[PDB]
Amino acid sequence: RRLLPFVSSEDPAQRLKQMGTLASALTELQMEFSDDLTYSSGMAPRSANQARFEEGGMQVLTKEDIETLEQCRAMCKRGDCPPLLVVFDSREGFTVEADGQIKDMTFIAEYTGDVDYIRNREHDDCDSMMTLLLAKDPSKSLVICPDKRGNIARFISGINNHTLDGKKKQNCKCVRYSVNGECRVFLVATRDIAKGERLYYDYNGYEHEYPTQHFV
């Protein structure tokens, strides 16, 4: 099972419209766009992000999958974003929906933001923290914090983990891979997604640190 590159919307106007909805939502949260993990002052240094610290080890991204990742990254640099729309919903807030077809196993996005120690965010109110590294010594565990800087991944919805039919909405998955010895968080489609379909993954895919009882 191999990672697939996304297919950008063919109409350049559709791509600019898509990128506009993301810029609009970032502005609403007073955020700066950032398509990479950032290491800021008073937070974690890039040297703390080493996948060998992950308790029980971390799967390694293959050379073939790294190539695909690099293509998608290069596509986003020149304006070929994945076909995604950030859309406000009154019951979910900002959400992300496919604005074109996304095939099973397609790379959607990396979860970016500021890398920080979990120890430093025990009190933080940010609703979009994502585990990066879970170390045996908890003072070395890292979390991605897209509160000041981030990308589209922070807007993607999660499933209700408590309802009998909530699992049926999941159409993508968040996974952590070692890339050049560092931890990285990616989102991948787990079935074919149609245009207009809202994206949902399991926020509690390893720990159970996200309350979802009230999710729609």
Binding site: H123, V188, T190
Partner: peptide, 14 residues
């Protein structure tokens, strides 16, 4: 009290 999304480090995608 800190809500955190989390993802597995093994098992692949499918």
């Amino acid at each position: 009290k800190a809500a955190r999304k989390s993802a597995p480090a093994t098992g692949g995608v499918k």
